[PDB]
Amino acid sequence: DTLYKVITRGMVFERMMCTSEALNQTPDMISATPARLTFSQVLVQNPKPIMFRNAGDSSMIDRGLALAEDVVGSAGDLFDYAVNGV
Amino acid sequence: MINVSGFGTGIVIVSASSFPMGFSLSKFADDESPISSKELEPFGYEMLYDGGLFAFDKAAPLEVSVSVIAGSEDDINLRILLNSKKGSFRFLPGIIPDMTTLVATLPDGGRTVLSNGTILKGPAIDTIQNTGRRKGNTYTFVFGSYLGAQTA
Numbered sequence: 001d002t003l004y005k006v007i008t009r010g011m012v013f014e015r016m017m018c019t020s021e022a023l024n025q026t027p028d029m030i031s032a033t034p035a036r037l038t039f040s041q042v043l044v045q046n047p048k049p050i051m052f053r054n055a056g057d058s059s060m061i062d063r064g065l066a067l068a069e070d071v072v073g074s075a076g077d078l079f080d081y082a083v084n085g086v
Numbered sequence: 087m088i089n090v091s092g093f094g095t096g097i098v099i100v101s102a103s104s105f106p107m108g109f110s111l112s113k114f115a116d117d118e119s120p121i122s123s124k125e126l127e128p129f130g131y132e133m134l135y136d137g138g139l140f141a142f143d144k145a146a147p148l149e150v151s152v153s154v155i156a157g158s159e160d161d162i163n164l165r166i167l168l169n170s171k172k173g174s175f176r177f178l179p180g181i182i183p184d185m186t187t188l189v190a191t192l193p194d195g196g197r198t199v200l201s202n203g204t205i206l207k208g209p210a211i212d213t214i215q216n217t218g219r220r221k222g223n224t225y226t227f228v229f230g231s232y233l234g235a236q237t238a
Binding site for chain 1: 140142143144145
């Protein structure tokens with residue numbers, strides 16, 4: 001889920017995820033453990049997003065053609081709970 | 087006034103099957119080094135690319151060379167040790183068959199014991215030099231358990 005940013009000596013990269021890991025256990029080293037990792041970049045169009053600070057001030061997502069899914073208790077009782085308060 | 091003499095050194099070597107009781111070493115050759123060992127190298131280091139250092143552990147054995155006068159009884163005993171085979175006699179788990187334990191005594195009084203190891207190599211027959219002297223036979227051991235004994 002998380003995207004990571006990597007800062008080497010002078011070079012800064014963004015949108016990376018780890019893709020590998022290779023531990024090693026050898027008589028050459030007992031105290032420590034030599035490891036070799038690997039990262040790959042997530043490629044996306046429009047690398048610089050555009051953001052609005054107002055939630056109402058935003059565009060319109062589109063959700064299409066779902067089902068009413070029914071499975072509901074009753075008609076009168078739910079309304080008599082919703083307006084009478086209980 | 088520090089005494090670093092080697093006069094009076096004695097060694098006892100005990101085995102698991104060949105010499106369950108052990109024998110003694112007292113006749114040390116003249117031309118060769120009577121006893122010596124290689125450097126113990128139990129640590130390592132790698133250099134990071136920032137510019138720093140990193141130190142760790144690594145495995146290290148211990149090797150000893152012992153020389154005797156050719157024709158002595160101790161040479162016969164050491165040749166007996168060298169002639170045995172690991173594939174022979176019994177087998178039981180995890181003992182490095184026929185452990186040889188070496189107990190060395192210093193003229194000063196300090197004692198050291200080394201275990202978990204076996205003989206490694208040595209001569210098979212005597213050799214004659216240009217001057218008509220048989221050379222001093224040498225034998226190499228390997229030890230895995232340097233028991234930290236340096237007591238007075």
